[PDB]
PDB file of C-alpha atoms in Angstrom:
ATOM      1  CA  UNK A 300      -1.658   3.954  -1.956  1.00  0.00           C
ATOM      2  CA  UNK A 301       0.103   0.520  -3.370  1.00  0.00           C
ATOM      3  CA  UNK A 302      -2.703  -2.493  -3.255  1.00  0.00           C
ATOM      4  CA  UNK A 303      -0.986  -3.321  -0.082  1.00  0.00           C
ATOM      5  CA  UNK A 304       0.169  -0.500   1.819  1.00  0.00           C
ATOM      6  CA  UNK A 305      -0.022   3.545   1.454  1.00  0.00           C
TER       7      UNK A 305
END
């Protein structure tokens, strides 16, 4: 979900 994870 974040711009890097999940």
């Amino acid at each position: 979900g974040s711009p890097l994870f999940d």
